[PDB]
UniProtKB/Swiss-Prot annotation:
GO BP terms: viral budding from plasma membrane
Organism: Influenza A virus (strain A/Wilson-Smith/1933 H1N1) (Influenza A virus (strain A/WS/1933 H1N1))
GO molecular function: RNA binding; structural constituent of virion
Other comments on record: Most abundant protein in virion. When expressed alone can form virus-like particles in transfected cells.
Oligomeric and partner information: Homodimer and homomultimer. Interacts with NEP. Binds ribonucleocapsid by both interacting with genomic RNA and NP protein. May interact with HA and NA. Cannot bind NP without genomic RNA.
UniProt-recorded name of the protein: Matrix protein 1
Keyword Translocase found: no
Function: Plays critical roles in virus replication, from virus entry and uncoating to assembly and budding of the virus particle. M1 binding to ribonucleocapsids (RNPs) in nucleus seems to inhibit viral transcription. Interaction of viral NEP with M1-RNP is thought to promote nuclear export of the complex, which is targeted to the virion assembly site at the apical plasma membrane in polarized epithelial cells. Interactions with NA and HA may bring M1, a non-raft-associated protein, into lipid rafts. Forms a continuous shell on the inner side of the lipid bilayer in virion, where it binds the RNP.
Location of the motif Nuclear localization signal: 106-110
Gene symbol of the encoding locus: M
Family that this chain belongs to: Belongs to the influenza viruses Matrix protein M1 family.
One GO CC term on file: host cell nucleus
Stretch list, region Membrane-binding: 11-163
Main location: virion
Length: 163
């Protein structure tokens, strides 16, 4: 309880992440399963990343981009690269998104905080943001965990804003 209040900052960051991530998951019976999986992963419950990823890969309804974002989130928290995640994490439907993703990636390597990263990321399109997530998925240690989460939240915000 006394200890518990000191950890409210990081727990509230995790609540914001799960809220953003769930906002891009279709309102289907499957959504309950994703929520309970995200809850268990954010609670530090023992998880096999390969089992989670195989389950993600074979889910119907989910768009490859939602699978990519969920794939990225699970990789960031559960202590390798999956092709379905790499393929999804892009904005190749606009050649200019790679140009912008590289420039955002350069800036994110300099950030430390979740809010600093989320604030910078929100100046970019959903397409550029997803391509930037793809760049980090290839080199996860290029940015801090808080910065990677800020980027995920910014990406979810821009996808939810277009749908």
């Amino acid at each position: 309880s006394g200890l518990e209040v000191l950890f409210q900052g990081p727990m509230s960051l995790l609540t914001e992440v799960e809220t953003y991530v769930l906002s891009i998951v279709p309102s289907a019976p499957l959504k309950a399963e994703i929520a309970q999986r995200l809850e268990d992963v954010f609670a530090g419950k023992n998880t096999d990343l390969e089992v989670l990823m195989e389950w993600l890969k074979t889910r119907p309804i989910l768009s490859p981009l939602t699978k990519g974002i969920l794939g990225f989130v699970f990789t960031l928290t559960v202590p390798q690269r999956r092709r379905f995640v790499q393929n999804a994490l892009n904005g190749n439907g606009d050649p200019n998104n790679m140009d912008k993703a590289v420039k955002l990636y350069r800036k994110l390597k300099r950030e430390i905080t979740f809010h600093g990263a989320k604030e910078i990321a929100l100046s970019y399109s959903a397409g550029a943001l997803a391509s930037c997530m793809g760049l980090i998925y290839n080199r996860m240690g290029a940015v801090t965990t808080e910065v990677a989460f800020g980027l995920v939240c910014a990406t979810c915000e821009q996808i939810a804003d277009s749908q």
